[PDB]
């Protein structure tokens, strides 16, 4: 902890103010309007991993209280003990007692509340209601099915969407400016494509790419660097493999698949995912083709998830695609 430059990029670039959170304009604007007018309700932030829920709530707490927010808010998470006993004593006294420093209201942040037991959630029901005059509750979640209906009924819900392309591009530009790095346009497109709307993945991949360059100052990150560091198939490889499977014979298709996979040690699962993505845009005459493709490829992916023989799995992928595409003729 000598300096912030020793931290991983995922933690070094954590937003500190609500203005540094990108891709959630609606939620940020609404929460800022609520806070400015002094009408903050009980909040629920539901979203997928790496969307900016924890960062957003921390920034909101820092804005409401300031630099010493950590001593004014009760933050609990899965790493801590959050049983019914903790709800009955710690949270209850925190909600029923005044602030030590200032004379404002009190904030309780239950991050990863989906990991809380049902008994604790039930106990929190009356805690939220009785002390609503001076206490506010924030619940952060990735899975809504783990939250009891009673708890959901007491909170106003905000959905964090997958990060749009523009926000990721702006954050990448900021990171490049800070790190004195050069990124190619195709490299940026590939980086955004493989992120799936997760900023942590983008930051980790960019940090890995910087370490790959021999001279990070005078060198630029190209699509080749991104593909090599992550060990992911290139679009050309996927196109060639699919074309060989769809138009060539069994021997040629098998040879092409093995040659493409051995040149860079590609993983079969990545090729399957890329081919599925490519085929999702195909206009097929018969629904049987789509049904067979989806079912057989899902079965192959499930089998791969448990190991098995790689060569047999690749042959199964080839055969499944070939048989499924035979329904497009009659």
């Amino acid at each position: 902890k000598r300096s912030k430059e020793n931290l991983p990029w995922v933690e070094k670039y954590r937003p500190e103010t609500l203005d540094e959170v990108y891709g959630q304009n609606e939620v940020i604007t609404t929460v800022r309007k609520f806070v400015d007018e002094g009408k903050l309700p009980h909040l629920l932030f539901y979203g997928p991993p790496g969307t900016g829920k924890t960062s957003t709530i921390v920034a909101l707490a820092r804005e409401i209280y300031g630099k010493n927010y950590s001593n004014m808010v009760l933050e609990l998470n899965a790493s801590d003990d959050r049983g019914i006993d903790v709800v009955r004593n710690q949270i209850k006294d925190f909600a029923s007692t005044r602030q030590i420093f200032s004379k404002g209201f009190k904030l309780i942040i239950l991050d990863e509340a989906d990991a809380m037991t049902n008994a604790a959630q039930n106990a929190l029901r009356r805690v939220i209601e009785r002390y609503t005059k001076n206490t506010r509750f924030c619940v952060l979640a990735n899975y809504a099915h783990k939250l009891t209906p009673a708890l959901l009924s007491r909170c106003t819900r905000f959905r964090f969407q997958p990060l749009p392309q523009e926000a990721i591009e702006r954050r990448i530009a900021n990171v490049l400016v800070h790190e004195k790095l050069k990124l190619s346009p195709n490299a940026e497109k590939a980086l955004i494509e493989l992120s799936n709307g997760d900023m942590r993945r983008v930051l980790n991949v960019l940090q890995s790419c910087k370490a790959t360059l021999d001279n990070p100052d005078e060198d630029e990150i190209s699509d080749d660097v991104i593909y090599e560091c992550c060990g992911a198939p290139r679009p050309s490889d996927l196109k060639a493999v699919l074309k060989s499977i769809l138009e060539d014979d069994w021997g040629t298709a098998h040879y092409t698949l093995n040659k493409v996979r051995s040149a860079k040690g590609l993983a079969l699962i990545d090729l399957i995912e890329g081919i599925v993505k490519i085929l999702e845009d195909y206009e097929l005459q018969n629904e049987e083709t789509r049904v067979h493709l989806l079912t057989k490829l899902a079965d192959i992916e499930y089998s791969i998830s448990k190991g098995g023989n790689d060569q047999i799995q690749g042959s199964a992928v080839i055969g499944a695609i070939k048989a499924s595409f035979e329904n497009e003729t009659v």
């Binding site: 998470n77 990735n142 993945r201 991949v205 992550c230 021997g251 448990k306 023989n309 047999i312 042959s315």
Partner: protein
Amino acid sequence: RKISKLAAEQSLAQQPWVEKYRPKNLDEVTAQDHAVTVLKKTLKSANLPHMLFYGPPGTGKTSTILALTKELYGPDLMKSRILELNASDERGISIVREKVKNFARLTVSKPSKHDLENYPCPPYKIIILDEADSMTADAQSALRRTMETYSGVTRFCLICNYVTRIIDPLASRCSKFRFKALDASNAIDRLRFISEQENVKCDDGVLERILDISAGDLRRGITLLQSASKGAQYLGDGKNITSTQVEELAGVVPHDILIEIVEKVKSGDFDEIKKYVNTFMKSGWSAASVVNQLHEYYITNDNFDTNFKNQISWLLFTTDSRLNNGTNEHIQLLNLLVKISQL
């Protein structure tokens, strides 16, 4: 009574070749440059991120992490800077909440002057959760905020064989490193070096055959090479190891038996196939090897049409999936052969 303690070098000189030739530094890793270069750059960048190593067995994940720790901290400071937990240790939610968290919260051990002068000594410790895929989902979730809150003084390394077993939040929090399979095109140099240092004499292509039989596992190849060397030394004939001996030691079915099985399948008679398979299972051949050899023979044969290959690929996939669940080999092999015979 008591025995005088052995030296480290002497002890290592009598260990199995897999342990004897384990990589000692990051430069000894053979075919993981895409990640080894990134890990090596951190010795000067001093910003090591949270790592998630995943890949097939025998690719060099544990060796890579051990070498990285040794290079970062050195022989003396490594012990106080590393906390290793594997499948042989209790790793429940309680352990994560108390032991792992307490270690993460602890201040980094004070480096000595010698360590600071000879090693980078990064200002953080490392927690290595080997075989992390065996941990429950709740325990994994308990690590999410511990990873981020105390990242200033602690870094996490999760090593697994099945990446899907790691909950999405942990995978997102970790920078992912995929270890590629070690084949005859990227691992021949290491096996050749090991053979040369062991004075193992083999014919041309023997090492390539060993690596092809290993199917991505360098540990298996090294063990097979050691077995072949032991056999050759016991014979004491001074001749070179041959590919047939390697195949016999690896359990590969002779090609003649494979041709007999293929002919029986071609005949199509159920009773003859059943009798031949009953006789075949008496030799102890592993079903997985037989299925792999049948796949190699059929898929790469030009004397079969497209529909036959399409059906046989799915049949082989189903048989392999069923065998992967720990099923009776006799019944599965008989079913596969009968189904192929009726194609």
